[PDB]
């Protein structure tokens, strides 16, 4: 379990997103593999 975000009971690990002044900036997920947040393109482009 890393720093921040919320945990997805499914295969997916943790999910974070930043909001600037109500407006969405970006959203990542945690790679339990390389141990880095990678662009979550699902949520975003959705």
């Amino acid at each position: 379990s890393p720093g921040r975000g919320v945990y997805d009971p499914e295969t997916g690990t943790w999910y974070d997103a930043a909001w600037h002044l109500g407006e969405l900036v970006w959203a990542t997920y945690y790679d339990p593999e390389t141990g880095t947040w990678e662009p979550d393109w699902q949520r975003m482009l959705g």
Partner: protein, 210 residues
């Protein structure tokens, strides 16, 4: 000579906010009334694409037309270093002129963000400045703004990015507030958007300390 071309990058806040729309803009000036006739070919990394807006032309009170073309760029493509080529063809050009742009090549570095209180010498005035130091970031495409109580503060200036010794950039953002807001104990936040930041966004708050 002939028609000239000028290719322009998207606004950083556009490239970085996914919920926004970045675009490259290709402008063409010195088009003759003789040859009012102008074509554009766009290519995302040598692949061609056909979705650009071509604005109707404008007369330029200098007996010349200006024609702009606007390409929407995808956030993935732009951030991933992809190259955009504007090819302008005009029946008056020996060769179709070609311009090309892209995010700077180089490992993105995460900026450090520090807020700095007004100088003691300053608290004599009826308006103080709060300062946001943003340093060691690459590439230089960044956006900085201020806020307080979830409203944006709009009486601020940000300098342009400045190259440092270790090849990164820094800048400074200055917010001017009434001294009483500052001494009231109000909390103000400096927000930064840049690609190497977690989720492209970071906020550092700043309020009277002792």
């Amino acid at each position: 000579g002939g028609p000239s071309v000028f290719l322009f990058p998207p606004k950083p806040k556009d490239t970085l906010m996914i919920s926004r729309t970045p675009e490259v803009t290709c402008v063409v000036v010195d088009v003759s009334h003789e040859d009012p006739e102008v074509k554009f070919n766009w290519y995302v990394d040598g692949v061609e694409v056909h979705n650009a807006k071509t604005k109707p032309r404008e007369e330029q009170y200098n007996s010349t037309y200006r024609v702009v073309s606007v390409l929407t760029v995808l956030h993935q493509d732009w951030l991933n270093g992809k190259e955009y080529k504007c090819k302008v063809s005009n029946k008056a050009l020996p060769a179709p002129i070609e311009k090309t742009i892209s995010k700077a090549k180089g490992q993105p570095r995460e900026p450090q963000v520090y807020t700095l209180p007004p100088s003691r010498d300053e608290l004599t005035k009826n308006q103080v400045s709060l300062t946001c130091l943003v340093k060691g970031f690459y590439p230089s495409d960044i956006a900085v703004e201020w806020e307080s109580n979830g409203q944006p503060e709009n009486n601020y200036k940000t300098t342009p990015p400045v190259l440092d010794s270790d090849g990164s950039f820094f800048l400074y953002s200055k917010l001017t507030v009434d001294k009483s807001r500052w001494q009231q104990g109000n909390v103000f936040s400096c927000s930064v958007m840049h690609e190497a930041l977690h989720n492209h966004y970071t906020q550092k708050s700043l309020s009277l300390s002792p």
